[PDB]
Amino acid sequence: LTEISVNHGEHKQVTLPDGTVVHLNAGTVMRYPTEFTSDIRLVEMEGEAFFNVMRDEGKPFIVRTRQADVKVLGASFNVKAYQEDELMAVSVRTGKVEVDMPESVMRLLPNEQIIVNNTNGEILKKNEDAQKVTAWLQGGLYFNRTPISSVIHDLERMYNQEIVLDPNVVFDDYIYGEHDNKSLEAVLNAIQYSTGIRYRKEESRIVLYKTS
Numbered sequence: 492l493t494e495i496s497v498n499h500g501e502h503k504q505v506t507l508p509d510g511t512v513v514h515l516n517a518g519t520v521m522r523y524p525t526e527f528t529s530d531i532r533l534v535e536m537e538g539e540a541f542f543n544v545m546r547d548e549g550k551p552f553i554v555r556t557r558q559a560d561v562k563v564l565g566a567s568f569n570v571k572a573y574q575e576d577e578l579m580a581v582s583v584r585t586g587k588v589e590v591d592m593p594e595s596v597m598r599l600l601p602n603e604q605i606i607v608n609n610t611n612g613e614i615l616k617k618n619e620d621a622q623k624v625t626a627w628l629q630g631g632l633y634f635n636r637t638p639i640s641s642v643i644h645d646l647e648r649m650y651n652q653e654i655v656l657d658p659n660v661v662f663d664d665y666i667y668g669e670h671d672n673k674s675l676e677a678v679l680n681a682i683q684y685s686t687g688i689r690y691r692k693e694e695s696r697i698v699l700y701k702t703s
């Protein structure tokens with residue numbers, strides 16, 4: 492078994508022993524064997540990774556996360572499952588994907604997604620543009636009615652910058668937009684434009700707030 496991790500502000504790309512390509516986003520850990528010797532190709536992951544799985548009908552590939560197993564024969568898909576986040580999501584780019592959870596099994600096709608809420612156990616299957624979901628691969632951000640708390644975790648991880656919400660302010664906002672390789676400052680300005688949320692820098696801390 493080997494394990495790789497990705498620091499905040501970084502990515503990694505790895506090719507697995509079966510030829511599967513995995514792109515790992517900031518803050519992610521993945522554990523995999525140097526050889527797939529069993530009847531399944533199993534990896535364990537916490538964080539976010541995009542898998543382009545080499546087709547082997549004879550040997551399913553399983554991405555095992557705390558919340559779910561994602562099982563394919565040959566497919567490309569994103570798994571966003573940061574242990575610190577309120578949401579986990581699996582989004583299919585190509586092929587067919589099975590998501591196995593304790594009390595739910597669902598099959599997904601391209602541009603379908605499952606969102607699991609880690610805090611209240613809700614499970615939502617819906618449509619979503621997987622090309623936008625996976626914009627992170629090219630340094631993009633994509634928000635589609637994304638809760639501000641989740642946005643902030645994405646920003647912290649992307650930019651390697653601590654960002655906290657003013658505890659005396661209500662942050663009930665949902666964020667929309669696509670940002671292509673923007674500065675943190677620019678992304679925060681765009682949020683300000685959309686929500687009124689302001690930001691100020693402190694000793695190694697950005698604090699978000701509101702006024703009026």
Ligand SMILES: [Mg+2]
Binds near residue numbers: 518519520537538
């Ligand atoms: Mg992490």
